[PDB]
Amino acid sequence: IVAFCLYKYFPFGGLQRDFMRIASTVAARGHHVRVYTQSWEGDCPKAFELIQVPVKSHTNHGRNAEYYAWVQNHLKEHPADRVVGFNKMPGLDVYFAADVCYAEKVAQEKGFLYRLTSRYRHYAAFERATFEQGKSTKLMMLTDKQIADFQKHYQTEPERFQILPPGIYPDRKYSEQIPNSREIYRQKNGIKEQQNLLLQVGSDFGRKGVDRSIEALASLPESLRHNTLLFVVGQDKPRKFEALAEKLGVRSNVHFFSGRNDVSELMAAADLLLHPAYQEAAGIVLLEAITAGLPVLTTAVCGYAHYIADANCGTVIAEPFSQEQLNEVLRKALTQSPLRMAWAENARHYADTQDLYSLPEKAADIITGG
């Protein structure tokens, strides 16, 4: 019996999609998969034993604490052979690092008033419980930067870390698309042959720099701008970003969508992925774009930004972030189709020659070992 703990399941998050693929891999090896969550949106594999954990606190942090306590009591009466968490909490045998190091985030960005909160104390305590010395929890990591951060704040025993290769779903790959996918999916989405489709995918618009993408769109020269659209796709509220698009006179150019299940089609249809995130532990969409043959503009803060430079299929905007640099890079990329075509080819080549896929098998090995 392998128990999985994540606070919330829904289809439009990387943490959730990585969990689904890892847990499905574990189940397919013959183990019984039990899932504890506060809430579950979308389909659930019939193999899974799904347990909804009742909570009543009025804050995320309070509910998380209640969840941990309830799960511990349930495990006391119904033992599992291994407990695997996708969120930081006590009691895990294995943790998957979908998040950044919270202690480092706070140290770098926050001050005294931020640290006064019960919210801070909780998240710090649950991270500490996972990473501190003396714990047995195996730590499945996405980036070397994550490891450096956790070592800095917790002096975690180095042997407990294991970096995983990426785990991009094969259905995003250019070679897994129907013939004429670009034309078909452009037509499906109302994109004209001559238009530029910019694509931004992710369920945290603010964190992922949707504002930066809108600013970049707005900065384009008049004629180019008139031929350019931006699709913003994810389970988040568009309100603030609609207001910004109106402010900048590009409201009609920007199309907002809730969570979509057709991201593979959108990447086949698009001309550039924009992902100028403020914070991103890794960024699965960056590598999805690589596998789709979709060139990428992103920021150096993203854990997976280096892959864009490695694949030579876009531009990584350096820190400190310059909006003017992103604006110029966008204008250049859009006006230089030969550059974009070369980037796309480079992306496809990298996707064909690099392991961007095996994460769930390697994570399942760690989970089921022994």
Ligand X SMILES: O=c1ccn([C@@H]2O[C@H](COP(=O)(O)OP(=O)(O)O[C@H]3O[C@H](CO)[C@@H](O)[C@H](O)[C@H]3F)[C@@H](O)[C@H]2O)c(=O)[nH]1
**Under the criterion CB under 6 A, does residue 233 sit at the interface with ligand X?**
yes
Task: Report CA-CA distances (Å) from 58 to 40, 66, 88, 150.
Answer: 19, 11, 20, 29
Q: Which of 202, 293, 295, 360 binds ligand X (CB under 6 A)?
A: 202
Query: Long-range contact list for 217-224, CB < 8 A, 24+ apart?
Result: 217/248, 217/250, 217/253, 217/254, 217/330, 218/245, 218/248, 218/249, 218/250, 219/323, 219/327, 219/330, 219/331, 220/327, 220/330, 220/331, 220/334, 221/331, 224/196, 224/331, 224/334, 224/335
For ligand X, the closer of residues 274 and 284 by Cβ is 284
Q: Among 33, 199, 254, 263, which residue interacts with ligand X (rule: CB under 6 A)?
A: 263
CB atoms within 10 A of CB 115: 13
Sheet holding 49-52, edge to edge: 49-52, 33-37, 2-5, 82-85, 94-96, 138-141, 161-163
- CA atoms within a 13 Å half-sphere pointing along the CA-CB vector of 109: 9
**Is 18 near ligand X (CB under 6 A)?**
yes
Our finding on whether 203 is near ligand X (CB under 6 A) is: yes
State which H helix or E strand residue 3 sits in.
Answer: strand 2-5
Contact with ligand X (CB under 6 A): which of 65, 201, 214, 229?
201
Q: Is 285 annotated as a binding residue?
A: yes
297 touches ligand X by CB under 6 A: no
Q: Tell me how crowded residue 354 is: count the other CB atoms within 10 A of its CB.
A: 16
Distance CA 263, CA 171 (A): 10
Nearer to ligand X by Cβ, of 220 and 359: the residue is 359
Residue 252 phi, psi (nearest 5): -70, -25
Nearest distance, CB of residue 258 and ligand X, angstroms: 7
For 26, list phi and psi in degrees, rounded to 5: -60, -50
Shortest approach of ligand X to residue 219 CB, angstroms? Answer: 25
* Residue 47, annotated as binding a ligand: no
β-strands 254-257, 228-233 pairing: parallel
Residues 71, 92, 284, 308: which binds ligand X (CB under 6 A)?
Answer: 284
Residue 127 near ligand X by CB under 6 A: no
**Residue 21 assigned to a binding site:** no
Q: In 3-state terms, what secondary structure has residue 229?
A: strand
Determine, following the binding rule CB under 6 A, whether residue 232 of this chain makes contact with ligand X: no
CA distance to 100, 261, 274, per residue, from 230 (Å): 28, 18, 9
Tell whether residue 198 is a contact of ligand X (CB under 6 A): no
The least CB distance from residue 362 to ligand X, in Å, is: 14
Could you tell me which residues are beta bridge partners of residue 247?
none
| Phi then psi dihedrals of residue 16, to 5 deg | -70, -40
Is 18 annotated in a binding site? The answer is: yes
Looking at the Cβ atoms of 93 and 288, the one nearer to ligand X is 288
Binding part of the chain for ligand X, among 8-16, 62-70, 175-183, 328-336 by CB under 6 A, reads 8-16
For position 67 contacting ligand X by CB under 6 A, the verdict is: no
With binding defined as CB under 6 A, does residue 140 bind ligand X? no
Q: For residue 208, say whether it is annotated as part of any ligand binding site.
A: yes
Q: Does residue 12 belong to the site contacting ligand X (CB under 6 A)?
A: yes
Q: What is the 8-class DSSP label of residue 49?
A: E
Q: Give me the least distance between CB of 361 and ligand X, in Å please.
A: 16
What is d(CA 344, CA 339) in angstroms, rounded to the nearest whole number?
9
> Is residue 204 a known part of a binding site?
no
Choose, by CB under 6 A, the member of 98, 274, 289, 359 that binds ligand X.
98
Q: Which is nearer to ligand X, 138 or 334 (CB)?
A: 138
The reply to whether 285 sits near ligand X by the rule CB under 6 A is: yes
Residue 239 in tokens: 């309100």
Distances (CA, A) of 212 to 202, 222, 322: 14, 18, 10
Part of the chain binding ligand X (CB under 6 A), chosen from 14-22, 33-41, 119-127, 221-229: 14-22
370 marked as part of a ligand binding site: no
Please tell me the count of residues contacting ligand X according to CB under 6 A. Answer: 23
Residues annotated within the binding site are 14, 18, 172, 207-208, 260, 280, 282-285, 288
Binding interface with ligand X (CB under 6 A): 12-15, 17-18, 98, 201-204, 233-234, 259-260, 263, 280-285, 288
Residues annotated within the binding site for UDP-alpha-D-glucose are 14, 18, 172, 207-208, 260, 280, 282-285, 288
